[PDB]
Amino acid sequence: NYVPEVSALDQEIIEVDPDTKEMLKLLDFGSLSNLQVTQPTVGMNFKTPRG
């Protein structure tokens, strides 16, 4: 039952995507100060090259 002194979930800044921010806003949680919006990846290439 090892317990750290501080929580690993505690972060002064948490990075979110704009879509996550919109989802939070729809649930009237857009006022959080810990959130930081990061620029999404420009290129949409997430699939393994078929071959």
Task: Kindly state whether residue 44 participates in binding RNA, applying the rule CB under 7 A.
Answer: yes
Task: Kindly state whether residue 45 participates in binding other proteins, applying the rule CB under 8 A.
Answer: yes
Task: Kindly state whether residue 41 participates in binding other proteins, applying the rule CB under 8 A.
Answer: no
4/43 with CB nearer RNA = 43
12/19 with CB nearer other proteins = 19
Q: Which residues are registered as beta bridge partners of 16?
A: 37
Three-class secondary structure of residue 35 per DSSP: strand
CB of 25 to other proteins, least distance (A): 20
Residues in the chain: 51
Given a contact cutoff of 8 angstroms between Cβ atoms, the answer to whether 35 and 14 are in contact is yes
